[PDB]
Amino acid sequence: VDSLRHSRSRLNIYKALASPSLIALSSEDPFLTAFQLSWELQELSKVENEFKAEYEELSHQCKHFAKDLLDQTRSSRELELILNFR
Amino acid sequence: VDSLRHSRSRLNIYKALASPSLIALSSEDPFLTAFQLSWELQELSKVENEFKAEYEELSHQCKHFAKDLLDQTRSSRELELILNFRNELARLKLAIKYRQKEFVAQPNCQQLLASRWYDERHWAGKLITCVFIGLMFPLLSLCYLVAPKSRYGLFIRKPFIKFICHTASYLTFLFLLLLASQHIVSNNPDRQGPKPTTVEWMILPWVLGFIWTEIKQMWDGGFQDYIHDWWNLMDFVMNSLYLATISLKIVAYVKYSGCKPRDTWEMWHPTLVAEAVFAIANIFSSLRLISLFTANSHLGPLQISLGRMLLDILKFLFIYCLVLLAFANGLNQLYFYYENSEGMTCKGIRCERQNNAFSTLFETLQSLFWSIFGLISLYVTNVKADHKFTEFVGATMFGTYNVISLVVLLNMLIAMMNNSYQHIADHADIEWKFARTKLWMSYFEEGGTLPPPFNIAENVRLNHQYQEVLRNLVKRYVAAMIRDAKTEEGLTE
Amino acid sequence: YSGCKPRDTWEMWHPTLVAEAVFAIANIFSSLRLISLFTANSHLGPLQISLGRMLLDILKFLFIYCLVLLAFANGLNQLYFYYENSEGMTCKGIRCERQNNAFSTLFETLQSLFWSIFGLISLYVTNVKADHKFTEFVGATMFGTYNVISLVVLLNMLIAMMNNSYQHIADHADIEWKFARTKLWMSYFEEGGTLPPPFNIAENVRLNHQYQEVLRNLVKRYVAAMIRDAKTEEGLTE
Numbered sequence: 006v007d008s009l010r011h012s013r014s015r016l017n018i019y020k021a022l023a024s025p026s027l028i029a030l031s032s033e034d035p036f037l038t039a040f041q042l043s044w045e046l047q048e049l050s051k052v053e054n055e056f057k058a059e060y061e062e063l064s065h066q067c068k069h070f071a072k073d074l075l076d077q078t079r080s081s082r083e084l085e086l087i088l089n090f091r
Numbered sequence: 092v093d094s095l096r097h098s099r100s101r102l103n104i105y106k107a108l109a110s111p112s113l114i115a116l117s118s119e120d121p122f123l124t125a126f127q128l129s130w131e132l133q134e135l136s137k138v139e140n141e142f143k144a145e146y147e148e149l150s151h152q153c154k155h156f157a158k159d160l161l162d163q164t165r166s167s168r169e170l171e172l173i174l175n176f177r178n179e180l181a182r183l184k185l186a187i188k189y190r191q192k193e194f195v196a197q198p199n200c201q202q203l204l205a206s207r208w209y210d211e212r213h214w215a216g217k218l219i220t221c222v223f224i225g226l227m228f229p230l231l232s233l234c235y236l237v238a239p240k241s242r243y244g245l246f247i248r249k250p251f252i253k254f255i256c257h258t259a260s261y262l263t264f265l266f267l268l269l270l271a272s273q274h275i276v277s278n279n280p281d282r283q284g285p286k287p288t289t290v291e292w293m294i295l296p297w298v299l300g301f302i303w304t305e306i307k308q309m310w311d312g313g314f315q316d317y318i319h320d321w322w323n324l325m326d327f328v329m330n331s332l333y334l335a336t337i338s339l340k341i342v343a344y345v346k347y348s349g350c351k352p353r354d355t356w357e358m359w360h361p362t363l364v365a366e367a368v369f370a371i372a373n374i375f376s377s378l379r380l381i382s383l384f385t386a387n388s389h390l391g392p393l394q395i396s397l398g399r400m401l402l403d404i405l406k407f408l409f410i411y412c413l414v415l416l417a418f419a420n421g422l423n424q425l426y427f428y429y430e431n432s433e434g435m436t437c438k439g440i441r442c443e444r445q446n447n448a449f450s451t452l453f454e455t456l457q458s459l460f461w462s463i464f465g466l467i468s469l470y471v472t473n474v475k476a477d478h479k480f481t482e483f484v485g486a487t488m489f490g491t492y493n494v495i496s497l498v499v500l501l502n503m504l505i506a507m508m509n510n511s512y513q514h515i516a517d518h519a520d521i522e523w524k525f526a527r528t529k530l531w532m533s534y535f536e537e538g539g540t541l542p543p544p545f546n547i548a549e550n551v552r553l554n555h556q557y558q559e560v561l562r563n564l565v566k567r568y569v570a571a572m573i574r575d576a577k578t579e580e581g582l583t584e
Numbered sequence: 585y586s587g588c589k590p591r592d593t594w595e596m597w598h599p600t601l602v603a604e605a606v607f608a609i610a611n612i613f614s615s616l617r618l619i620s621l622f623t624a625n626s627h628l629g630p631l632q633i634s635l636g637r638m639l640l641d642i643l644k645f646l647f648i649y650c651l652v653l654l655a656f657a658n659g660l661n662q663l664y665f666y667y668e669n670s671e672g673m674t675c676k677g678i679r680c681e682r683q684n685n686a687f688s689t690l691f692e693t694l695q696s697l698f699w700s701i702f703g704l705i706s707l708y709v710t711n712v713k714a715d716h717k718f719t720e721f722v723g724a725t726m727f728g729t730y731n732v733i734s735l736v737v738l739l740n741m742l743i744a745m746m747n748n749s750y751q752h753i754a755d756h757a758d759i760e761w762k763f764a765r766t767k768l769w770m771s772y773f774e775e776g777g778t779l780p781p782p783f784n785i786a787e788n789v790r791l792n793h794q795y796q797e798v799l800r801n802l803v804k805r806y807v808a809a810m811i812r813d814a815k816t817e818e819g820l821t822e
């Protein structure tokens with residue numbers, strides 16, 4: 006009954022979820038909740054084809070957040086534990 | 092009495108008028124007073140050709156102001172009221188008329204257009220559903236034209252279906268055209284102007300329908316706003332050929348009729364020119380498929396970008412033609428004394444054994460043109476006698492022409508288009524969307540509603556609410572950009 | 585079938601012939617898969633990938649060119665098909681020592697138009713036994729127009745397209761090459777293949793316990809070190 010409002014609300018919510026601060030505060034596994042959001046946004050940027058640029062950019066920032074979160078390690082065994090966990 | 096002062100005063104006044112703040116304060120309809128100023132400045136930048144850059148920039152800022160003023164809406168019905176105010180979407184048609192590009196490539200407006208277009212998946216489903224309609228369009232069009240009721244009559248009336256039907260009709264046209272040249276339906280060549288064949292009958296309705304559609308369109312336009320689109324020019328020149336073919340074929344029908352061999356016909360026999368003209372018409376008719384691909388999403392932008400690089404090539408073929416003329420005029424002088432033609436079976440370059448190429452001016456032009464693609468063998472520049480000096484100077488000129496026109500001039504064409512592609516590609520989608528929107532709006536009315544084969548107070552209250560909408564938009568804009576974005580600029584001394 | 589019959593006197597579609605042809609095409613594809621081996625090198629990898637990326641920038645183009653080719657072939661067939669000569673010639677077509685009868689059939693016309701790109705079609709094709717020296721000119725005109733369009737105006741635009749796209753792609757070259765190489769490596773780390781094709785025929789509560797500590801340390805370091813420390817490095821404003 007309201008296309009514009011619904012679309013904009015969806016975009017606002019998704020931009021709210023994909024912010025490094027909020028992820029770091031309230032989340033269990035940062036790495037997963039980053040991957041999931043990246044994939045969901047990337048695929049969703051196809052069914053909606055007017056706000057494509059925003060969704061692509063959001064996926065990209067999720068990618069870079071995940072990388073930088075990985076980077077902050079200072080121990081080999083730390084890294085191996087992170088990469089092995091299932 | 093004072094050119095400098097007058098020109099500068101004009102420029103100052105026009106820059107004063109085209110400022111978002113002043114427009115927002117003292118104006119009745121922001122949207123109009125933006126369009127009008129944009130058009131006036133754009134056209135005025137042509138008669139005055141010293142301050143061109145300023146006028147172009149001013150037109151651009153007017154365009155962007157109009158777009159941003161549109162953007163500040165937060166209600167679907169708000170948007171529809173804005174676009175409808177003046178039988179439907181009149182203001183958007185006005186924007187299309189005023190070449191206002193950025194205003195139309197707005198995501199909200201695009202969603203509105205898409206929703207009114209599809210009117211209710213994946214590529215396999217879309218493929219099967221798409222191909223399905225073509226295998227049944229004729230009876231569907233029949234159902235509309237005989238029983239315009241809500242059983243099948245509305246189904247065609249939906250735009251997307253109308254577009255599918257017209258595409259299917261055009262594909263049928265090309266199929267019949269391509270089938271025209273089959274020896275199964277080409278009973279015999281040796282006949283002066285025989286009666287039209289079966290395929291020659293089935294073509295005629297499509298020609299008539301296309302002619303009528305172009306007549307309607309030119310009646311609407313009248314050589315104004317109609318000729319500008321190069322596709323319409325192509326349609327005109329492409330229709331004229333078919334008309335001439337019909338007339339001349341009738342002439343041949345009534346003058347000559349016999350079973351005389353094809354070989355022993357004199358030049359300018361009407362049937363021959365009829366066939367040639369028909370073939371050229373076939374080429375132009377088939378070549379108009381490219382215009383169908385603006386409706387795709389992967390090819391559209393690319394097609395437009397190829398479209399833009401033609402003033403970057405036509406301004407070049409001219410120089411090349413000039414060089415070609417100079418060199419042909421040269422090489423004719425050296426040779427024309429050696430016109431051999433001593434009982435040869437053929438003559439010219441268009442023969443198995445090339446001979447006598449550099450004899451006439453026309454022949455020399457032909458040789459020079461074909462030399463580009465390396466289809467001219469070298470032993471042309473040779474004479475029956477042994478004057479082994481002119482044979483060398485001729486070869487020297489020929490080589491110089493080849494160097495100039497294939498290593499020094501063409502590479503510069505490449506290095507020109509290459510640089511222009513970055514100037515253009517930056518503005519690709521903003522323009523592709525405008526083209527696609529024009530294509531769509533061509534269908535939204537009850538005007539054509541038929542494939543060419545089967546072609547033969549009231550507003551005081553509106554003003555009352557519209558003004559409130561305008562007040563809200565201008566308030567939001569003034570508060571949200573010209574104030575809020577000012578407090579984001581870098582410091583200074 | 586089994587006999588000692590001469591190779592020359594075999595009818596078309598003899599099974600051995602199509603067998604040889606299919607085997608040869610299979611040989612081409614089999615040999616062509618070496619390029620995929622070079623992602624494991626360091627000097628060629630990135631280059632191979634970058635060539636890999638420019639295929640949606642060419643396939644979206646061969647389509648347009650094919651459309652133009654179809655239009656022009658459909659044109660040139662109309663003009664000529666009345667002159668199908670075939671009066672006892674030893675061969676026929678363009679694939680012969682003396683080219684003849686090129687613009688007769690639709691398929692033949694398509695062949696001629698395709699080969700014309702590389703300049704392997706001699707000019708005297710557009711000529712007929714009779715002396716109708718008007719159609720012989722219009723045919724040459726169409727042929728020349730096709731050559732101009734498809735070799736001076738359309739191909740250069742392919743060049744100027746890929747050229748611009750290379751800078752869009754090359755910026756992201758190693759970040760992608762490394763991913764491809766890593767996938768190639770991970771294809772081998774398991775005890776799955778372990779043989780060349782010729783010779784082919786509580787437990788986790790403690791882990792969660794330590795993993796959570798690692799996560800806490802990482803997130804603490806990140807929050808302190810970037811979203812705080814890098815905020816105090818931005819330029820001034822009004």
Ligand SMILES: CCCCCC(=O)OC[C@H](COP(=O)(O)O)OC(=O)CCCCC
Nearest residue numbers: 483484485486487488489490491492494495
């Ligand atoms: C690149 C020069 C090589 C010299 C070869 C040579 O001596 O032959 C003369 C050539 C032509 O070759 P011939 O006529 O066969 O002698 O003249 C040029 O094309 C000059 C190009 C002029 C370009 C501006």
Ligand SMILES: CCCCCC(=O)OC[C@H](COP(=O)(O)O)OC(=O)CCCCC
Nearest residue numbers: 412415456457460721724725726728729732
């Ligand atoms: C560059 C024009 C030189 C003129 C040469 C000439 O008169 O010959 C006609 C040429 C073809 O040469 P002939 O058929 O041999 O006459 O027509 C074109 O190719 C036009 C290209 C059309 C390009 C859009």
Ligand SMILES: O=C1CN(c2cn[nH]c(=O)c2Cl)CCN1CC1CCC(F)(F)CC1
Nearest residue numbers: 257258261301326329330375376379382383
């Ligand atoms: O463009 C013309 C011009 N016409 C003429 C007129 N005279 N001669 C012609 O060869 C042609 Cl094509 C009528 C047919 N279309 C195609 C339209 C419907 C199908 C499409 F959406 F793909 C592109 C627009």
Ligand SMILES: O=C1CN(c2cn[nH]c(=O)c2Cl)CCN1CC1CCC(F)(F)CC1
Nearest residue numbers: 610613614615616617618619620621622781
């Ligand atoms: O890629 C194929 C697919 N195969 C088939 C299957 N069927 N037909 C074929 O021609 C081929 Cl090559 C099996 C062989 N490899 C090569 C692999 C090992 C060697 C390499 F690391 F270089 C690249 C990967």
Ligand SMILES: [Ca+2]
Nearest residue numbers: 308322323326
């Ligand atoms: Ca038209």
